[PDB]
Design a protein around this ligand. Sequence first.
Ligand SMILES: [Zn+2]
Ligand SMILES: [Zn+2]
Length: 76
Amino acid sequence: GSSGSSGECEVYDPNALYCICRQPHNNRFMICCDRCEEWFHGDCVGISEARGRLLERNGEDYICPNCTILSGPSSG
Ligand SMILES: [Zn+2]
Ligand SMILES: [Zn+2]
């Protein structure tokens, strides 16, 4: 049977999971990874509010842990 529900969008929706902790975007600090290109919470991924803030202004490429944890740096 025809299935599809494309209506209003919000964070409240519990079905919306981003961070690895399976939690909605809350006040918690969030950053945009480059490896997995996913949304996570600083505290969760360790990255502190400040640690990330700089990565922006400075111009550094943040790399969540869950990513590196898998494999080391480039070049195997
Ligand atoms: Zn989280
Ligand atoms: Zn990542």
